[PDB]
Design an enzyme around this catalytic site. Sequence first.
Site, PDB file in Angstrom:
ATOM      1  N   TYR A   1       0.809  -1.214   0.000  1.00 55.86           N
ATOM      2  CA  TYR A   1       0.000   0.000   0.000  1.00 55.86           C
ATOM      3  C   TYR A   1       0.847   1.270   0.000  1.00 55.86           C
ATOM      4  O   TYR A   1       0.281   2.309  -0.296  1.00 55.86           O
ATOM      5  CB  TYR A   1      -0.860   0.053   1.216  1.00 55.86           C
ATOM      6  CG  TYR A   1      -2.346  -0.169   1.023  1.00 55.86           C
ATOM      7  CD1 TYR A   1      -2.853  -1.453   0.781  1.00 55.86           C
ATOM      8  CD2 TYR A   1      -3.189   0.935   1.125  1.00 55.86           C
ATOM      9  CE1 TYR A   1      -4.223  -1.624   0.635  1.00 55.86           C
ATOM     10  CE2 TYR A   1      -4.551   0.770   0.986  1.00 55.86           C
ATOM     11  CZ  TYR A   1      -5.040  -0.503   0.740  1.00 55.86           C
ATOM     12  OH  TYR A   1      -6.394  -0.651   0.580  1.00 55.86           O
TER      13      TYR A   1
ATOM     14  N   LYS B   1       0.893 -13.909   5.805  1.00 58.06           N
ATOM     15  CA  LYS B   1       1.011 -14.901   4.738  1.00 58.06           C
ATOM     16  C   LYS B   1       2.513 -15.293   4.714  1.00 58.06           C
ATOM     17  O   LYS B   1       3.223 -15.394   3.711  1.00 58.06           O
ATOM     18  CB  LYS B   1       0.519 -14.242   3.447  1.00 58.06           C
ATOM     19  CG  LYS B   1       0.367 -15.281   2.339  1.00 58.06           C
ATOM     20  CD  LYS B   1      -0.271 -16.596   2.769  1.00 58.06           C
ATOM     21  CE  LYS B   1      -0.145 -17.482   1.568  1.00 58.06           C
ATOM     22  NZ  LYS B   1      -0.219 -18.869   1.985  1.00 58.06           N
TER      23      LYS B   1
ATOM     24  N   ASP C   1      -4.659 -16.837   4.481  1.00 54.91           N
ATOM     25  CA  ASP C   1      -5.674 -17.445   3.657  1.00 54.91           C
ATOM     26  C   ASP C   1      -6.578 -18.393   4.467  1.00 54.91           C
ATOM     27  O   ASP C   1      -7.806 -18.440   4.323  1.00 54.91           O
ATOM     28  CB  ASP C   1      -4.950 -18.112   2.491  1.00 54.91           C
ATOM     29  CG  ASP C   1      -3.778 -19.013   2.807  1.00 54.91           C
ATOM     30  OD1 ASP C   1      -3.674 -19.459   3.939  1.00 54.91           O
ATOM     31  OD2 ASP C   1      -2.983 -19.280   1.901  1.00 54.91           O
TER      32      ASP C   1
ATOM     33  N   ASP D   1      -6.884  -4.727   5.186  1.00 50.79           N
ATOM     34  CA  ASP D   1      -7.904  -4.219   4.288  1.00 50.79           C
ATOM     35  C   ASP D   1      -8.894  -5.350   3.936  1.00 50.79           C
ATOM     36  O   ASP D   1     -10.084  -5.312   4.290  1.00 50.79           O
ATOM     37  CB  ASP D   1      -7.168  -3.664   3.063  1.00 50.79           C
ATOM     38  CG  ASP D   1      -8.036  -3.209   1.898  1.00 50.79           C
ATOM     39  OD1 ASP D   1      -7.618  -3.361   0.768  1.00 50.79           O
ATOM     40  OD2 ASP D   1      -9.138  -2.691   2.063  1.00 50.79           O
TER      41      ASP D   1
END
Lengths: 414, 414
Positions: free
Chosen positions: B158, B228, B281, B305
């Site tokens: 971002y 992740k 995930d 987000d």
Amino acid sequence: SKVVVPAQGKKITLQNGKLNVPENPIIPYIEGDGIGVDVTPAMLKVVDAAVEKAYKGERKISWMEIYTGEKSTQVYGQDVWLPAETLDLIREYRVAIKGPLTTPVGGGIRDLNVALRQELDLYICLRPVRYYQGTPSPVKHPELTDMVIFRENSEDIYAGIEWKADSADAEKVIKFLREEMGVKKIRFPEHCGIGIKPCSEEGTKRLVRAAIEYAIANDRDSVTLVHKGNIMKFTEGAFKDWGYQLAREEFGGELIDGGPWLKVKNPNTGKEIVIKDVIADAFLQQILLRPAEYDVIACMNLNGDYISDALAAQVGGIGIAPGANIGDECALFEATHGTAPKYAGQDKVNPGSIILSAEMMLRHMGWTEAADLIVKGMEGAINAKTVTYDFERLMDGAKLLKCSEFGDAIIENM
Amino acid sequence: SKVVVPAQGKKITLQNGKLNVPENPIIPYIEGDGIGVDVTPAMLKVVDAAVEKAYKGERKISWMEIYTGEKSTQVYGQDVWLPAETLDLIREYRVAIKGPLTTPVGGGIRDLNVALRQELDLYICLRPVRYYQGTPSPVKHPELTDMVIFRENSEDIYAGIEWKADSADAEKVIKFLREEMGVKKIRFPEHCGIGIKPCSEEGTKRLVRAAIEYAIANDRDSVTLVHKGNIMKFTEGAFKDWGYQLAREEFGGELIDGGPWLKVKNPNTGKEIVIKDVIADAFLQQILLRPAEYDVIACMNLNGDYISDALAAQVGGIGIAPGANIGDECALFEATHGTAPKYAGQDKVNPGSIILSAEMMLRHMGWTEAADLIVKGMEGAINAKTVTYDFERLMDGAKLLKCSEFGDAIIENM
């Protein structure tokens, strides 16, 4: 060299794009670690059963065990997690199937599932998620979901291009970025790790082309491109622009309204496929609130991962989700879940996932009848509430079956 | 210079970490574009009402309109989307609140919400999602969700460090990466866009510290670090390791079992907070299947987000989700949804989001009573099925109210 190729059995041949499958093809399978030892006997059994029934003895698969993961170290010596001949043999024999794989920590080794994807350039990760009538679900209306995910496998932040905070390497690229590139937006240049996210034109259009051709080949109603393009303009933004561009340039797409969206007329059924896009954070919401609005999805590596996982949990199929990795020269079908060591060997986990990846395998080979019998089996077993522990904990009035027995419950419903 | 500071009204002061709020503080608000013109009158009205009731005339907010977005070009001249004095005035007046903002395309301009975050180094994006009894939901059990999201705002993909496929810049860093860094894993080095993902130690530990202190300050049961990290070792992996490290080193964390997880004893109530992690995930799945297992969440920018968006849709509150951006020197509270132009001015959208971000504002100022009255109002209005269009379309037997009227429905239930 440690794999024994079957005495009976012939190789699938690739005759320019088309598979030429013999009636007794040799199929490599990787057993898988953890519960691989449980789920894979079930799959070999329900597939043999389904092809034994479909063609009444005429066709038979000659299964050939190849090795990756933890079991590979027990066969080739403790250091080799991914044998060079697994890659050769999948490449050679054209379609293979696998169980869950273990990548160790402490070894400097990267994700062996991802290694197989990149090393064999199986750039399409296809994830079909649909609801099977009867599966306990966290949502009010899981039957509304019938989507097919075309997740790009070869680029993005999943490539694994990264450097450690405080390494010389990291030090070097942050120096390059600040000094030569003139970046002022790294908030804390010291003790900072850097990952590289690449998205290329050749990369997205070979995926999108796969996606749209799938929609024509199966009369799906649309292709949604999902991306985080408003923030990541030059990669995600790029992916959407290049995707739209391909629908226009190669598939004759025309604007609906004053754009953004396009129509592609399916050259076989006359129906118009809508090419559209939605931003990946809002999409996570739209699949929950309006799922029937979405159908073939095309996306980059990381999002594709999060989306597929999210979709599979909504429809109740975290343990029965199938998957294929497809390239231009061979394909890899797979149980999409972990090795689950806690239970390994107890014959109790659900073998849904890898079985359904085997009907995708079967379909890919053109053995439509056999594949249709497995999903016939699945629906019947599930519907008979004759289920494995994970679905039985959530059903009232189901019969608890072991893994092998759900295997048998699928062959009994065929 | 085009903002008019109120004649009555005193500035909030920062007396070393602590806010010193006067009884008549001046609060900057940015009206917002699109439906900002509808939702923000409602919020000024329900907050004035709630502070008028809470302190019986003693305290009053002197609202001062500052400008960003589209409306800023109408006030300062078509080229200025983000006035330098908005940044000065938010910095100066210490807490502000805003409506949805529009970033234009065609201008080379990056996301104005993100610009405000980085330019004022409001490194904490706090997203509390809970269920409000009565809201129509896509899931069977939305009352199980009561989580608080601590999304890191200042680093990750971002930041906006990226270069165009075929630019000289892109050409240059891909050259550097392949030649000097020796990367062989960019599949298609030509026509490729590059984004940079930075994660730093100072970056994750100032967020995690915020997260754990929140869990002690409010007796929350755990802090999950979601990442992740199995694939992105040096940034996401880094984030989790540094997070765990901080719980051990600064908060006395001790292993439960033989790790990974830690216990932190809340120095006020004696209760142990669990510090744990889950891969991003799988987490997307766990919030749907087991939500009651999760409570304070700490994560990097992008995941944060996707998570918050996903959580808000499950509990039925895409239009009533609140948000705060918090730094060490000022705070920004915000409607977390778009400008929705289609409806702008029709007084019909839900003003839930920005109102609830205003009770977060109010709480942050220590005006606990006023804040508690807004959530008292919300629950009552919602429960009275006296709702705005978006909730009424999904309820049987509700009364359709306009935006301003839901404003009034909240003050009537106070």
